[PDB]
């Protein structure tokens, strides 16, 4: 599956994994920390 | 790494404790003295902590021995951990300052012979008195040996000094840990362990204190 | 070479002879911050001074802290010694910080110029005869001269011992100050008070009994 | 009150707008059974709403005549009056991540230029090289100023022009 | 040479043996370069001169009974009427401040940047002692010794007044009165705990 891992390392597959990662990071943040308009403490 | 006496007879010894240092048995399981420039400092430190601990045990037991026998001292029966509160002809600050000036003389005189041996054996003000040349650091001799010892069988005497000194360092650590738990005189701990030796071990005092 | 992880490939710029002969090199740079050799030369200075100021600060926290909890001092908490000692003070804090930044900037800019070019402050005619003892040693970060009064540098043996003792006590004190700040934020008590609270109940009073290891 | 404004914990249009949103949620809630699944989500929306108003009034945001929080985007009016978390703290919390990505992509380009053919590792990204540069790019401003002091951040007039 | 300051220790190479007041005492290598040693051999003598004059002035006020060295510049605040041998001085602060700024600079700048001399023969020896034949270095050694002791004495004056708030004689009498309760340790300053 070395060719399958080179397919997993192509541009749109990395794009759709990394954008789901950076989407579902910010989404879990806005679940556990609702409505951040201002930098609080 | 020879037929030397050993702390554990049979095991290997790391080899740098051959017998040149007085009263060695190869006991260094943490391997501290690998660099010999640390080992020389550790030898002088064991001599100094040992001689002050021998003076400590002789100055803790003997006042308590003559207190429990009973003389008429101004300080008699006072604890060694309570002699600081006891008042004297001067308050303790002047005592500490005189101490930290006299030992500031003596310790630097000793340290200059540590960093260059044989180079402090002449007085400042009376430049005719001297210690005899050929002494090692830790053992000055001369006026520090007024009774004519160390003129034969010096290795056995150094081994006696370091054995009594290691025993007295353990005794002073005992004085600390055995005056901090039960809070009594260290001779009145021997009195209780001779009153009933079985009904007061360290374990029963620990479990009663727990 | 006694690495921080025994099985890791040490970064190759921490295995150069310039970097292996450096104080406290345990092969620890997992984020590649010193890959340029002059970046490493700058950050070695930054580590020495972040660690010496931390050793001075952590000593000034826990030596009077342990001498407060054992009596014969009444030094307050380190997070309270700015609130107090401004009343027992000849000056307010603003003038004091201004004098502080002048007296410290005169030192720190001379150190800046010595790091950017070694032996800079030793050129004659700078001070009034004092500049001759300001070349430092052959390596930067360890000046000596007036900064070694007891004379522990005139050995050339056990010198890496003194270097590594300074670096390890300094890294431990930097972790201790990051501690002091964090164990203040977490429970609002003092550091020796937190040590007593851990030593009276270790298995229940720790950083798993507050809101900072939260699931 | 910096520029004709008012604290949101002081203004009444802010509290009136909170009561307006809670009134809409309440008249929306009045249709359902009290323990059903829509009513739980509506009360959770009310709880998030009230927590949002409490934490906007707590941080000292400035309301206007409209009753809406405002952002003072000037240091020296945010640092002096305690509004640095509005713009002045996230204007570096952004730029750390911006220069982070701009440094990671820069180093991924420069570390793939000197190969056999670079373009194949731009449509097919070398993932261990990418994750190595992702982790070790954490100190990017440090490495950026150390690269600027060389002149290895810029390139000289070896660049490609037309006809000056 | 004539002295070793810590016996057994070696003398540094950058201290000349014919130099007056030599002991080898330079643990910082602070005068290693010869230009810095030439500046410091001039400045130590002048610190010793002005400290001998300072300790003589700080002791003669109390041995003549006119307050101390500390409160002698205390008329400029809370009143006036400075004295000297009991004789009044009708001068305010700014006039004598300007006279000390001007009339001393006309001798200091005449001394300093007109060379680097520290023992000028001629008018500064009216009686005649230093003909530089045989008794030059002996008198220079006595001057250095007495001046170093005077610098130590004035730093002791400063620390003694900063710790006890008294004068030199006013606490030398207490050290002679209670020798074991009137030293540098019974105050709560110099020794922090005991
Ligand atoms: C450039 C224009 C712009 C700006 C400045 C903003 C600004 C904002 N928007 Mg907005 N928005 C915009 C355009 C913009 N938006 C557009 C175009 C839309 C339509 C798509 C929206 C739709 C929108 C919605 C629907 C919401 C916002 C929200 C917000 C707030 C952000 C709260 C948040 O998510 O915190 C994020 C805070 C962080 C600290 C994230 C940083 C990430 C981590 C913590 C740092 C990294 C840590 C670690 C190293 C990561 C691990 C790495 C991993 C590999 C292990 C903020 C006021 C939210 C809000 O509350 O409104 C006020 C909200 O609900 N916006
Ligand atoms: C306006 C008048 C005037 C002028 C032009 C000079 C000019 C000079 N004096 Mg002079 N002097 C004056 C008034 C003056 N003085 C007065 C009124 C006194 C008596 C108080 C002296 C006492 C005096 C001594 C004792 C010496 C000089 C020296 C010098 C020369 C060195 C120049 C220098 O470094 O500046 C000095 C500029 C300064 C800003 C001085 C800094 C403050 C000093 C260091 C005192 C601080 C003490 C402090 C406690 C120690 C530092 C902290 C420490 C604890 C870590 C120069 C020719 C020296 C010399 O000839 O060197 C060879 C020397 O040895 N003078
Ligand atoms: C080491 C060492 C140290 C630090 C001390 C420290 C002390 N001893 Mg001590 N002692 C020691 C060894 C030591 N001892 C030994 C080896 C013996 C035997 C004694 C026998 C002894 C007695 C019998 C008494 C003390 C007392 C004291 C306390 C006051 C000292 C005093 O009165 O000045 C001593 C002043 C001198 C001028 C003596 C120095 C000159 C000698 C004679 C040279 C030889 C002090 C805590 C006294 C105490 O605790 O009572 C409250 C006390 O009564 N010691
Ligand atoms: C070998 C060194 C040594 C040791 C182990 C001790 C140990 C002790 N001293 Mg002590 N002390 C020492 C040297 C030493 N001192 C010196 C050199 C002086 C100056 C002469 C004093 C002056 C002193 C005073 C004045 C007091 C103590 C007291 C104490 C006790 C409680 C203080 C504490 O927390 O510790 C403790 C048993 C106190 C005490 O006995 O009360 C419990 C007390 O009041 N000490
Ligand atoms: C010179 C060594 C020495 C000696 C002779 C004693 C003697 C004594 N200790 Mg003690 N102790 C010592 C060192 C010593 N201690 C040290 C170093 C510590 C610190 C950990 C303590 C801490 C301590 C506590 C906390 C208690 C005692 C108690 C006692 C007494 C009862 C014995 C007991 O319960 O076992 C205690 C034995 C030990 C703690 C182990 C000591 C280990 C030594 C160093 C090895 C043995 C030395 C040698 C081979 C044989 C010694 C005899 C010889 C010197 C003549 C007894 C008088 C108890 C007491 O006062 O009740 C009456 C008690 O509660 N001791
Ligand atoms: C470095 C450093 C650090 C980490 C702190 C940290 C702190 N300072 Mg502080 N401070 C510093 C340098 C530092 N200070 C300097 C250089 C000065 C001199 C101007 C002060 C003067 C100062 C004052 C005057 C006060 C603080 C206060 C505080 C605390 C409130 C936040 C906090 C623990 C406050 C405090 O302790 O009150 C609770 C306070 O009132 N600081
Ligand atoms: C577009 C540029 C710009 C403009 C028009 C202003 C405008 C103003 N600034 Mg300002 N400022 C700016 C950029 C700017 N700032 C930047 C980049 C900084 C540095 C981060 C500051 C730091 C600053 C401070 C520290 C102060 C001002 C103040 C002021 C006010 C006078 C005025 C509202 C002052 C103020 O509060 O008003 C009296 C004031 O004290 N500014
Ligand atoms: C500020 C006054 C001052 C100055 C400029 C000097 C200068 C000198 N001394 Mg000297 N000395 C002084 C005060 C001074 N001394 C005092 C007060 C004592 C008595 C404690 C001595 C005792 C002394 C001895 C015993 C010897 C010297 C020697 C020397 C010479 C070489 C050492 C050197 O480089 O010193 C340079 C010194 C300085 C630049 C002064 C720096 C002061 C620092 C910054 C602060 C000091 C803090 C202090 C400890 C406490 C306050 C040099 C000419 C040696 C020599 O050959 O004599 C000529 C020598 O063997 N000195
Ligand atoms: C300087 C310092 C503290 C100094 C403290 C001082 C002066 C305190 C003074 C006071 O207390 C007193 C005296 C009295 C109080 O009343 C007043 C104050 C003023 C409060 C702490 C440093 C603290 C510094 C710390 C904790 C630094 C930690 C850095 C780490 C761990 C980085 C590791 C890495 O960078 C490497 C090494 C390699 C990369 O590849 C990987 C990573 C992981 C990125
Ligand atoms: C102590 C001192 C200098 C100390 C410096 C020392 C020890 C440095 C030693 C070292 O550098 C060496 C040698 C070698 C290096 O390798 C190591 C160290 C160890 C670093 C100078 C004092 C110098 C002190 C001086 C010059 C004092 C002069 C005093 C005057 C003029 C007083 C005048 C008045 O008292 C009257 C007359 C009347 C009053 O009413 C009014 C006033 C004004 C108060």
């Amino acid at each position: 599956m070395k060719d399958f891992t080179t397919y997993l390392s192509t541009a749109p597959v990395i794009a759709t994994i990394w954008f789901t990662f950076t989407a579902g990071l910010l989404i879990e943040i806005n679940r556990y920390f609702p409505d951040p308009l201002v930098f609080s403490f | 790494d020879a037929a030397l006496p050993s702390w554990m007879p049979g095991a290997d010894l790391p080899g740098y404790l051959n017998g040149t240092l007085p009263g060695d048995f190869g006991f260094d399981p943490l391997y501290l003295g690998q660099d010999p420039v640390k080992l020389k400092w550790y030898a002088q430190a064991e001599l100094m902590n040992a001689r002050f601990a021998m003076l400590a045990v002789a100055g803790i037991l003997v006042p308590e021995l003559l207190s429990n026998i009973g003389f008429s001292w101004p300080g008699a029966g006072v604890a060694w951990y309570d002699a600081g509160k006891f008042e004297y002809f001067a308050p303790a600050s002047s005592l500490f300052g005189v101490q930290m000036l006299l030992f500031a003389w003596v310790e630097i005189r000793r340290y200059q012979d540590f960093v260059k041996p044989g180079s402090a054996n002449q007085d400042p003000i009376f430049t005719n008195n001297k210690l005899p040349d050929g002494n090692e650091p830790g053992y000055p001799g001369g006026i520090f040996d007024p009774f004519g010892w160390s003129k034969g069988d010096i290795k056995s005497l150094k081994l006696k000094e370091i054995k009594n000194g290691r025993l007295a360092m353990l005794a002073f650590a005992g004085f600390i840990g055995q005056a901090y738990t039960t809070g009594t005189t260290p001779l009145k701990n021997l009195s209780t362990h001779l009153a009933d030796p079985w009904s007061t071990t360290v374990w029963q005092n620990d479990l009663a204190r727990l | 070479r006694q690495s921080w992880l025994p099985g890791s490939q040490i970064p190759a710029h921490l295995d150069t002879p310039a970097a292996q002969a450096l104080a406290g090199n345990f092969g620890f740079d997992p984020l590649g911050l010193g890959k340029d050799p002059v970046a490493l030369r700058w950050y070695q200075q930054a580590e020495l001074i972040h660690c010496r100021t931390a050793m001075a600060g952590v000593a000034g926290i826990l030596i009077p802290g342990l001498l407060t909890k054992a009596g014969a001092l009444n030094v307050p908490e380190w997070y309270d010694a700015g609130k107090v000692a401004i009343e027992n003070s000849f000056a307010p804090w603003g003038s004091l910080l201004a004098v502080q930044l002048f007296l410290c900037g005169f030192v720190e800019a001379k150190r800046w110029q010595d790091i950017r070019k070694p032996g800079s402050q030793g050129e004659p005619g700078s001070f009034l005869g004092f500049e001759a003892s300001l070349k430092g040693t052959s390596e930067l970060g360890y000046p000596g001269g007036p900064f070694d009064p007891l004379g522990l540098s005139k050995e050339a043996d056990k010198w890496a011992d003194w270097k590594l003792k300074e670096v390890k006590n300094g890294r431990l004190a930097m972790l201790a100050f990051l501690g002091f700040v964090a164990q203040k934020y977490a429970t609002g008590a003092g550091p020796v008070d937190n040590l007593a609270a851990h030593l009276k109940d270790p298995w229940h009073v720790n950083y798993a009994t507050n809101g900072v290891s939260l699931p | 009150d910096i520029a004709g404004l008012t604290p949101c914990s002081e203004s009444k249009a802010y509290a009136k707008l909170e009561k307006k949103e809670l009134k809409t949620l309440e008249k929306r809630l009045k249709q359902y059974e009290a323990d059903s699944a829509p009513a739980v989500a509506l009360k959770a929306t009310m709880e998030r709403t009230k927590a949002r108003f409490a934490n906007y009034a707590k941080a000292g945001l400035l309301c206007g005549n409209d009753g809406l929080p405002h952002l003072i985007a000037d240091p020296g009016l945010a640092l002096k009056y305690g509004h640095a978390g509005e713009v002045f703290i996230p204007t570096f919390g952004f730029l750390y991540v911006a220069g982070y990505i701009g440094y990671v992509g820069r180093q991924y380009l420069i570390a793939v230029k000197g190969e056999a053919k670079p373009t194949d590792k731009e449509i097919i990204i070398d993932v261990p090289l990418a994750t190595k540069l992702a982790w070790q790019g954490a100190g990017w401003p440090l490495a950026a100023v150390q690269e600027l002091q060389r002149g290895t951040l810029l390139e000289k007039e070896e660049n490609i022009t037309v006809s000056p | 040479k004539a002295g070793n300051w810590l016996p057994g220790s070696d003398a540094p190479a950058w201290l000349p043996d014919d130099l007056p007041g030599n002991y080898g005492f330079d643990p910082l290598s602070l005068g290693k370069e010869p230009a810095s040693l030439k500046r410091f051999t001039e400045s130590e003598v002048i610190h010793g001169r002005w400290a001998m004059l300072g300790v003589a002035g700080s002791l003669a006020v109390e041995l003549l009974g006119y307050g101390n060295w500390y409160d002698a510049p205390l008329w400029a605040v809370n009143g006036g009427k400075a004295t000297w041998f009991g004789i009044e001085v009708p001068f305010d602060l700014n006039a004598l401040l300007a006279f000390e700024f001007v009339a001393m600079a006309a001798a200091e700048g005449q001394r300093g940047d007109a060379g680097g001399v520290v023992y000028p023969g001629g008018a500064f020896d009216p009686l005649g002692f230093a003909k530089d034949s045989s008794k030059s270095g002996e008198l220079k050694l006595k001057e250095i010794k007495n001046g170093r002791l005077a610098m130590v004495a004035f730093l002791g004056f400063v620390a003694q007044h900063a710790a006890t708030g008294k004068g030199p004689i006013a606490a030398l009498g207490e050290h002679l009165a209670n020798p074991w309760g009137a030293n540098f340790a019974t105050n709560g300053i110099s020794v922090p705990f005991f």
Side-chain angles (χ1 to χ4, degrees):
Chain A
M1 61 180 288
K2 183 179 90 275
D3 288 328
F4 186 74
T5 58
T6 57
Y7 176 71
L8 263 286
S9 67
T10 59
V13 179
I14 282 178
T16 190
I17 290 169
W18 187 256
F19 284 164
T20 52
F21 183 80
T22 58
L25 185 62
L26 272 296
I27 282 169
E28 298 285 341
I29 288 170
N30 289 114
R31 180 177 66 188
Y32 287 105
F33 294 96
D35 301 327
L37 180 59
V38 66
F39 182 77
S40 65
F41 292 99
Chain B
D1 198 358
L4 74 154
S6 181
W7 64 281
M8 186 190 293
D12 58 349
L13 284 314
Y16 59 88
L17 299 177
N18 52 4
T20 63
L21 275 74
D24 55 351
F25 304 106
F27 183 75
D28 184 57
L30 292 179
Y31 289 154
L32 294 174
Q34 290 180 354
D35 292 333
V37 294
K38 291 182 179 181
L39 182 59
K40 182 174 73 174
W41 182 262
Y42 287 162
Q44 299 294 321
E46 194 175 20
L47 285 175
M48 290 304 292
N49 282 293
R51 288 183 173 100
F52 276 101
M54 285 187 282
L55 265 72
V57 179
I60 288 168
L61 293 182
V62 176
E64 292 295 328
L65 189 147
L66 276 310
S67 297
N68 291 118
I69 291 174
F71 281 176
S72 67
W73 293 97
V78 292
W80 63 271
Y81 60 92
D82 291 329
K85 290 175 70 174
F86 186 78
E87 66 182 2
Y88 296 101
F89 64 95
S93 66
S94 298
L95 271 53
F96 184 74
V98 171
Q99 170 185 355
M100 293 297 287
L101 290 172
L102 295 174
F103 282 91
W105 184 261
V106 169
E107 285 275 0
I108 300 300
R109 292 293 296 170
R110 183 180 62 83
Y111 181 74
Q112 199 273 328
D113 190 74
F114 177 72
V115 296
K116 183 182 284 185
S119 65
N121 51 4
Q122 186 177 1
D123 314 8
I125 184 168
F126 293 103
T127 60
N128 200 3
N129 293 313
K130 67 184 290 293
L131 302 177
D133 197 1
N135 52 2
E136 65 270 13
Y139 303 99
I143 197 168
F144 294 103
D145 184 75
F147 287 160
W149 293 102
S150 69
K151 295 295 289 182
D153 188 71
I154 189 167
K155 182 174 86 274
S156 177
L157 285 171
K158 288 181 181 181
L159 187 142
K160 288 176 183 179
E161 189 169 16
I162 199 68
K163 281 187 175 181
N164 281 298
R166 288 166 181 173
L167 181 62
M169 286 186 282
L170 289 172
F172 186 75
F175 291 162
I176 297 171
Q178 184 166 344
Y180 180 76
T181 58
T182 183
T184 62
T185 297
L187 194 63
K188 296 284 101 175
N189 293 318
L190 185 63
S191 180
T192 60
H193 187 71
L194 290 175
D196 45 355
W198 302 90
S199 297
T200 172
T201 61
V202 63
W203 295 345
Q204 291 191 0
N205 293 120
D206 273 308
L207 267 297
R209 191 173 65 247
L210 190 146
Chain C
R1 50 103 58 228
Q2 293 296 109
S3 177
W4 67 282
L5 279 174
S8 294
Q9 290 179 357
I10 294 98
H13 62 282
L14 273 76
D15 287 331
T16 64
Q20 285 182 355
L22 199 63
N25 191 358
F26 299 107
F28 178 75
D29 193 1
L31 302 183
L33 296 179
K35 187 177 286 188
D36 180 73
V38 181
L40 181 64
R41 181 179 178 271
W42 180 255
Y43 297 156
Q44 200 271 129
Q45 304 293 310
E47 193 175 17
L48 290 179
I49 295 156
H50 265 284
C51 81
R52 286 168 183 170
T53 59
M55 284 184 282
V58 169
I61 290 166
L62 62 87
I63 299 300
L66 289 172
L67 289 169
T68 301
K69 294 295 289 182
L73 284 180
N74 197 359
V75 177
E77 299 294 330
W78 62 273
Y79 60 95
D80 288 332
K83 184 69 176 177
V84 304
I86 199 170
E87 295 87 4
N88 191 0
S89 177
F90 53 87
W93 63 269
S95 177
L96 188 62
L97 187 145
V99 176
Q100 172 182 354
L101 265 66
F102 287 166
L103 271 299
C104 291
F106 188 77
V107 169
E108 286 271 313
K110 292 176 99 294
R111 185 179 60 74
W112 174 271
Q113 181 58 33
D114 187 75
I115 292 170
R116 291 180 68 188
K117 179 178 180 292
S120 297
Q121 302 295 322
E123 62 93 19
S126 297
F127 278 176
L128 297 172
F130 189 72
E131 75 274 15
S133 296
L134 269 63
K135 297 179 178 67
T137 57
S138 297
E139 56 187 356
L140 71 156
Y142 299 98
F147 299 102
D148 191 3
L150 272 298
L152 273 301
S153 302
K154 296 189 288 291
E155 295 293 327
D157 189 73
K158 75 177 75 68
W159 176 245
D161 289 329
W162 289 111
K163 289 187 185 297
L164 191 138
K165 289 162 83 174
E166 190 170 17
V167 173
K168 290 173 77 73
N169 278 298
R171 290 171 181 174
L172 184 60
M174 288 189 282
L175 294 176
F177 182 74
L178 180 62
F180 292 153
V181 177
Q183 330 193 36
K184 178 182 75 173
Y185 282 166
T187 183
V192 186
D193 197 2
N194 289 322
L195 180 58
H198 180 70
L199 287 174
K200 295 289 103 176
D201 193 0
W203 305 96
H204 297 87
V205 182
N206 54 6
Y207 79 110
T209 319
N210 53 6
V212 88
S213 178
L214 73 163
Chain D
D1 184 76
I2 291 177
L5 293 177
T6 177
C8 292
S9 63
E10 295 293 328
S11 66
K12 300 288 104 178
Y14 181 77
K16 187 180 263 77
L17 189 57
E18 179 182 1
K19 292 184 185 293
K20 181 181 182 293
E21 291 185 354
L22 268 297
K23 180 69 180 296
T24 59
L25 289 170
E26 181 177 359
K27 67 177 74 173
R28 187 181 176 188
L29 181 63
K30 285 175 68 175
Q31 290 179 355
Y32 295 102
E33 288 85 3
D35 292 332
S36 66
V40 175
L42 285 172
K43 292 187 265 77
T45 305
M46 290 181 181
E47 294 298 323
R48 290 190 295 268
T49 301
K50 290 176 68 67
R52 183 177 64 247
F53 280 101
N55 210 163
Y56 289 171
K58 186 181 264 77
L61 295 175
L62 291 175
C63 283
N65 289 320
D66 298 327
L68 295 177
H70 288 82
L71 299 179
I72 300 299
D74 179 70
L77 276 74
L79 295 174
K80 187 182 285 186
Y81 295 98
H83 295 92
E86 289 180 349
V87 176
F88 180 71
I89 295 169
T91 187
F92 294 96
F94 175 72
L95 288 180
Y96 181 75
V97 187
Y100 189 91
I101 298 168
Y103 183 79
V104 169
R106 176 188 175 91
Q107 294 302 112
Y108 183 75
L109 290 174
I110 297 171
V112 83
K113 288 292 174 67
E115 290 181 354
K117 187 167 88 275
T119 62
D120 286 332
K121 290 187 182 180
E122 291 183 353
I123 55 167
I124 304 165
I125 296 99
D126 195 1
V127 177
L129 184 62
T131 57
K132 185 257 287 182
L133 269 307
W135 287 108
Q136 78 178 1
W140 75 269
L142 279 73
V145 65
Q146 293 295 322
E147 189 175 3
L148 190 275
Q149 289 181 357
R150 292 291 190 272
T152 56
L153 186 64
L154 292 175
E155 186 172 0
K156 278 79 177 175
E157 290 182 355
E158 196 181 2
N159 292 319
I160 176 173
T161 60
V162 183
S163 295
Chain E
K1 189 179 180 181
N4 204 3
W5 75 265
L6 191 146
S9 179
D10 54 354
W14 59 89
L15 281 81
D17 291 330
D18 291 333
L19 201 150
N22 193 359
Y23 292 96
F25 179 69
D26 193 3
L28 295 179
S29 69
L30 197 61
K32 182 186 284 184
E33 290 291 326
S36 295
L37 190 274
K38 186 174 73 176
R39 199 267 190 194
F40 293 156
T41 48
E42 184 175 0
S43 67
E44 187 178 17
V45 182
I46 302 166
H47 273 94
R49 262 71 170 274
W50 287 99
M52 283 183 280
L53 296 177
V55 65
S58 297
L59 289 173
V61 170
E62 287 179 345
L63 267 296
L64 271 300
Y66 295 103
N68 56 3
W69 61 272
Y70 183 77
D71 292 329
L74 260 294
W75 61 270
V77 67
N78 297 114
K81 293 181 177 66
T83 60
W84 182 69
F85 292 163
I87 299 168
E88 296 290 327
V89 174
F91 289 156
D92 55 353
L93 181 63
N94 303 118
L96 57 88
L97 188 145
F99 185 77
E100 290 177 355
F101 181 75
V102 170
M104 191 66 208
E108 273 279 359
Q110 187 64 40
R111 173 185 62 80
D113 292 330
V117 64
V118 65
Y119 299 105
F124 290 102
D125 193 359
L127 198 151
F129 290 101
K131 297 297 290 183
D132 293 332
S133 65
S134 179
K135 287 178 94 288
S136 65
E138 183 68 28
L139 292 172
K140 290 176 186 178
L141 180 62
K142 292 181 182 179
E143 190 172 16
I144 286 297
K145 285 189 153 180
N146 284 300
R148 287 172 179 175
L149 185 61
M151 287 185 280
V152 173
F154 184 73
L155 201 278
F157 290 167
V158 173
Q160 180 180 1
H161 190 275
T164 60
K166 293 180 184 292
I169 301 298
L172 184 272
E174 290 183 353
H175 180 69
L176 292 175
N178 193 1
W180 292 94
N183 55 4
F184 71 97
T186 60
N187 53 3
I189 295 96
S190 296
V191 175
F193 297 104
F194 290 160

